Amino acid sequence: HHISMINIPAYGHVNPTLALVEKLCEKGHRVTYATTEEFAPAVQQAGGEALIYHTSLNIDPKQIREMMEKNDATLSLLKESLSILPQLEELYKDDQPDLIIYDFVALAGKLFADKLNVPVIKLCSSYAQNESFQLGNEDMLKKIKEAEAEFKAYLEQEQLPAVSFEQLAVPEALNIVFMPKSFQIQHETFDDRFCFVGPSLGKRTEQESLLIDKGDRPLMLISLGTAFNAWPEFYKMCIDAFRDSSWQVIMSVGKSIDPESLDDTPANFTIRQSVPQLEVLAKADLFISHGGMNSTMEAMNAGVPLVVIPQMYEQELTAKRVDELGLGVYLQREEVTVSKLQEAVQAVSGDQELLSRVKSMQKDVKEAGGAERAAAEIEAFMKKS
Numbered sequence: 332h333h334i335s336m337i338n339i340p341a342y343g344h345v346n347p348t349l350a351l352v353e354k355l356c357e358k359g360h361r362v363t364y365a366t367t368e369e370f371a372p373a374v375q376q377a378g379g380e381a382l383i384y385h386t387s388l389n390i391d392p393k394q395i396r397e398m399m400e401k402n403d404a405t406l407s408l409l410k411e412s413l414s415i416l417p418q419l420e421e422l423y424k425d426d427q428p429d430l431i432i433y434d435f436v437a438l439a440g441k442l443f444a445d446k447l448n449v450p451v452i453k454l455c456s457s458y459a460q461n462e463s464f465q466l467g468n469e470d471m472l473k474k475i476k477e478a479e480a481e482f483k484a485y486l487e488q489e490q491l492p493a494v495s496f497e498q499l500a501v502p503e504a505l506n507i508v509f510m511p512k513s514f515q516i517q518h519e520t521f522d523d524r525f526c527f528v529g530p531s532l533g534k535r536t537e538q539e540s541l542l543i544d545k546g547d548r549p550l551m552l553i554s555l556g557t558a559f560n561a562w563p564e565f566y567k568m569c570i571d572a573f574r575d576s577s578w579q580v581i582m583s584v585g586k587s588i589d590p591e592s593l594d595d596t597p598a599n600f601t602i603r604q605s606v607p608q609l610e611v612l613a614k615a616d617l618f619i620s621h622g623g624m625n626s627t628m629e630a631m632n633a634g635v636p637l638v639v640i641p642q643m644y645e646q647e648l649t650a651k652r653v654d655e656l657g658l659g660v661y662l663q664r665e666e667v668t669v670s671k672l673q674e675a676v677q678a679v680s681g682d683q684e685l686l687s688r689v690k691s692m693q694k695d696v697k698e699a700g701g702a703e704r705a706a707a708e709i710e711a712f713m714k715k716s
């Protein structure tokens with residue numbers, strides 16, 4: 332059976348799938364992955380055949396911080412669906428797939444699946460959505476009124492057979508979500524076509540030899556993820572906040588920034604562009620994180636409290652949520668100072684009550700499926716559909 336995974340080129344939107352791809356293959360299913368070259372090694376390691384599309388999205392964190400002019404930045408994902416559909420058509424012309432699985436922003440995978448009337452499962456790598464819970468601000472539901480400005484540029488080259496924008500908000504037969512249903516916002520509103528398996532961890536690209544036995548001293552991880560990590564000011568404040576302190580600190584600065592471009596690295600710090608986050612959290616006593624869903628779930632999967640410094644709306648939702656569920660503290664940026672970094676690491680470390688809350692989220696996130704349940708919910712959907 333040929334399963335075709337369609338996704339954007341983004342670590343946070345593609346890493347959960349890797350563990351999934353490893354399982355489907357272990358079940359004797361050919362899995363093809365429509366990605367760029369940046370991800371073909373990760374996809375190839377899981378067992379997928381990478382099939383490449385030349386892409387229109389930004390990958391380098393520098394390019395994501397600039398092109399923050401916000402001229403309908405949401406449209407990017409639409410235009411990208413319209414660049415990617417033609418190339419998916421060609422990639423699979425004589426390799427039609429039995430099952431298309433597409434990430435919630437890879438609309439190209441929806442259109443492509445419609446156009447071939449092939450079964451389609453939707454992976455939600457962030458919060459899922461439905462008729463009740465539409466995620467987004469006042470200003471981000473009033474931006475899908477400028478999504479319609481481009482939707483009247485849909486009749487400038489081709490046409491829609493009828494209404495086709497209420498069919499991108501609408502969920503599919505099976506919608507796998509990579510958090511536990513408790514952590515989903517408006518959980519109760521989500522019916523049985525949503526399947527909340529929590530974090531989908533497995534093997535990752537071999538990162539550098541970062542052995543870190545630490546000692547009888549506590550270990551803190553610092554990372555703003557893989558896209559909104561282009562903030563030199565923050566990485567200096569962390570060095571100022573925790574140099575030569577109780578804490579052993581491992582800080583990922585992303586690909587936007589030189590570990591030599593900073594102040595000289597304290598004896599207690601390790602500083603890299605990239606760390607093996609799953610390995611570090613196996614030893615971390617605290618994680619200063621940006622509230623990426625992968626990071627938030629990888630933390631809870633390791634029993635690791637959270638200081639959440641969100642960069643984007645999606646991330647502020649996850650940041651409020653972590654506070655509301657008392658799984659750590661919400662520290663806003665443009666409120667982030669060296670004193671405030673210290674106050675929060677203080678307030679979260681040695682709150683035994685808070686630590687017990689994430690120790691039970693550790694259970695609650697593993698009690699959900701994982702990649703195994705998702706691969707079961709997938710194959711079962713294959714037999715049925």
Ligand SMILES: O=c1ccn([C@@H]2O[C@H](COP(=O)(O)OP(=O)(O)O)[C@@H](O)[C@H]2O)c(=O)[nH]1
Nearest residue numbers: 342343556557583605606608623624625626
């Ligand atoms: O130094 C790093 C930084 C990030 N990641 C991985 O990148 C993903 C980040 O996804 P998330 O949704 O947290 O944030 P995003 O990167 O999408 O902004 C997670 O799976 C991390 O395990 C990693 O492995 N090492």
